C-alpha cells in the first residue's frame, strides 16, 4: 500500500486530523517535539515523502520525482487511503509547497496549509528574487553528484544557522545521508529547478506563512509575495530565528507558533 511505502504513522484522537509532512533532508522524525503538543486533541498522521532514507530506493521513479508534482500526487493517495479530508496540513519547504499544490486538485482534503520556510523558486529573475543567480547554480549543480556530501556539509551550518558541532546539525545530517546518493541528487535538482509561480493563484484554502528573520533559502520578501499571489486568505508570521529549519533549530521559538496556526483558523 502507498502508506506502508510511506511510513505511514497514526498517533492521538479527534475529529480533526493534522498532517504532518517533513522537507527536503529529514524525516517524520523531525516532528518529535511537536506531536506531544497535538496528541491530547488532534489525530495525526505522519509520513515521510518517497525518497527519504527511510524509503525503499525501489519505489523512487526518478521520472516522477524530478518535478514536485509527482510529490502532490503522492499527498493525495496517502489521505484518500487513510480517508483524511479537511485536514490540517503542516509541511515544511518542498512538503509545503506539494501540498497547495494538491489543493488546487483536492481542495476537500484540506482546511488549512501551514508552511514552514516555504519558497515557490530558487532561481532569480529580473522580476523576482528567490535568493540563487542561475549561472552560479550551473556551476554547482554540474560537479553535485561528485560532491554531494562534501556541499552539503560545506554549506549546513549557513542553512541551519547553527555550529557545525551542534545537535541540531548532527540530527539534519544523520537523515539526509541515509538518502541514497543519487536519490538525493534527484531530489536536490527538482528543489533547485522549482517554478510553483503559476499554480499560486489558483490557491484558495487558507495558507499560514511561518519565516525565519534570515533564511538563506527563503529571502524574507518571499512571505510577503506569497501573500500576494496567493488566491484565498492567507496570514505571514516572520519570527525571532535563523536557519530554513526553525522547527529543528529553535524549537522553542517554533513550535509555539506553528501550534497556534494550528490551532487557530484564520476563516469561519
Given at each position: ?36 503538543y497535538?496528541?491530547?486533541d ?15 530506493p525501489?519505489?523512487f ?25 479537511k ?8 512538503s ?45 549543480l ?72 534570515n ?5 524574507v ?48
Amino acid at each position: 500500500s502507498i502508506g506502508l511505502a510511506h511510513n505511514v504513522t497514526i498517533l492521538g484522537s479527534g475529529e480533526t486530523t493534522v498532517v504532518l509532512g517533513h522537507g527536503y533532508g529529514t524525516d517524520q522524525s523531525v516532528w518529535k517535539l511537536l506531536v506531544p503538543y497535538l496528541v491530547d486533541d488532534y489525530k495525526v498522521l505522519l509520513y515521510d515523502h518517497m525518497g527519504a532514507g527511510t524509503t525503499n530506493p525501489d519505489y523512487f521513479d526518478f521520472d516522477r520525482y524530478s518535478s514536485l508534482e509527482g510529490y502532490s500526487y503522492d499527498l493525495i493517495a496517502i489521505l484518500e487511503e487513510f480517508q483524511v479530508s479537511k485536514c490540517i496540513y503542516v509541511g515544511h519547504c518542498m512538503s509545503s509547497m506539494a501540498a497547495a499544490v494538491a489543493s488546487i486538485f483536492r481542495p476537500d482534503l484540506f482546511h488549512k496549509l501551514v508552511m514552514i520556510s516555504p519558497t515557490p523558486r530558487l532561481i532569480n529573475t529580473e522580476e523576482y528574487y528567490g535568493g540563487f543567480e542561475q549561472k552560479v547554480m550551473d556551476e554547482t549543480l554540474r560537479s553535485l553528484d561528485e560532491n554531494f556530501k562534501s556541499l552539503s556539509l560545506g554549506t549546513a551550518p549557513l542553512l541551519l544557522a547553527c555550529d557545525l558541532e551542534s545537535a541540531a546539525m548532527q540530527e539534519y545530517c544523520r537523515t539526509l545521508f541515509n538518502m541514497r546518493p543519487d536519490i538525493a541528487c534527484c531530489i536536490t535538482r527538482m528543489i533547485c529547478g522549482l517554478d510553483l509561480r503559476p499554480y499560486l493563484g489558483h490557491v484558495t484554502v487558507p495558507c499560514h506563512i511561518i519565516q525565519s528573520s534570515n533564511d538563506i533559502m527563503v529571502p524574507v520578501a518571499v512571505g510577503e509575495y506569497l501573500r500576494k499571489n496567493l488566491g484565498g486568505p492567507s496570514v505571514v508570521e516572520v519570527m525571532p530565528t535563523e536557519g530554513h529549519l526553525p522547527h529543528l533549530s529553535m524549537p522553542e521559538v517554533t513550535i509555539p507558533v506553528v501550534l497556534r496556526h494550528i490551532r487557530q483558523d484564520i476563516t469561519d
